């Protein structure tokens, strides 16, 4: 498995603004060190909603077709744009969990970096989020170049087939 980048090397959306990032995001594409297009091929699209709490944390809710609801708390870390997973002790399979907003323009897209340790294995990925379920090839290509930048290759990149069931909230 390809080694995880540091949080200093992974970019950080500057003056990240919790207010504008909140809300519904659709996972247009995902790319990461455990991903295999040749075996996996593609995956049904799912949404992630970032509900800004008065803490300034997020109550992150992912809606998935299968509807299945994956609900977590993202707690702000050392630099705005970074988070850890709230109450990690409740997740047997998780010994480390880092979230970092690499790039976003809040209106259209975001590229967000997820790193973690499960069963003594170091995983990482970046999702291509989009406020709509479709995105520009420039941004799809841009996203590709970004994951290539992190050491990943074409077999590590995957795009979601979109749906209407569950994910529109």
């Amino acid at each position, epitope marked *: 498995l390809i*080694p995880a980048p540091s949080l*200093l090397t992974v970019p950080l959306q500057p003056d990240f603004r919790s207010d504008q990032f909140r809300g519904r995001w659709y996972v247009v594409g995902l790319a990461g060190n455990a991903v295999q297009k040749k075996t996996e091929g593609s995956f049904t699209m799912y949404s992630t909603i970032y509900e800004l709490q008065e803490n300034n944390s997020y109550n992150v809710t992912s809606i998935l077709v299968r509807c299945r609801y994956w609900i977590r708390t993202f707690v702000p*870390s*050392s630099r705005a744009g*970074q988070f850890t997973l709230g109450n990690m002790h409740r997740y047997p399979q998780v010994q*480390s969990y880092n979230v970092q907003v690499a790039t976003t323009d809040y209106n259209q897209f975001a590229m967000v970096f997820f790193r973690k340790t499960s069963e003594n294995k170091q995983y990482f990925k970046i999702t291509l989020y989009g406020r709509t379920k479709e995105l520009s090839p420039e941004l799809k290509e841009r996203f590709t170049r970004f994951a290539k930048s992190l050491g990943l290759k074409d077999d590590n990149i995957i795009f979601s087939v979109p749906t209407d069931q569950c994910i529109d909230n």
Partner: antibody
Amino acid sequence: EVKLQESGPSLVQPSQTLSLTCTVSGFSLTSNSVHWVRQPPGQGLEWMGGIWGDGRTDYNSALKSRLSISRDTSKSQVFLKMNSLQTDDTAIYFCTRCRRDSSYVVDAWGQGASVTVSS
Amino acid sequence: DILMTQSPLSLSASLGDKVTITCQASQIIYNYIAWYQQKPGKAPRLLIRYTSTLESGTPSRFSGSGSGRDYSFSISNVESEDIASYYCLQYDNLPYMFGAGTKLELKR
């Protein structure tokens, strides 16, 4: 060869403001971070803050209120200004750099500037 | 912050002893740890980066290992010039955070 030199007055009154200059050589500020670490007498090392190649900066949260790190890319100079000094800011102030290629590890240090905060 | 607990605080060593400093990180830092040597009067110089990678200049008797939150630095055969303070550094995220350090003294 890569070189960093801290300079500026090495005796500061508690009232006053510290100003150190770091003059780098062997590399460009466009392409590298420069970070200040300090070390009080007989104590450990403390990262104070830094200026990345981009021009953006970050600081130790304990010193954000007082510390200001700037630069002049053309003159190959990075500047520190810290205010509201106290006796316990007496230390050796090291100038330092970290590069993206090495994953921002600290790999070069200046000689260090003794700074005594005394009246 | 990520806290770095370095130990032991002080070490007494005879020439040719194997010696091992240890560092535990408050969080997992995915091998982004470095080890520095600092002789009194001089700056710290980097010996090992990324857990186990030696710098040009580091003698082979220096080495480091670990993963996750737990890491270590070992001198295989202590020489006279190894006398110094050693520090570990986390550089996975800001703030950069150093261990409290190990002052290595030589017995004779």
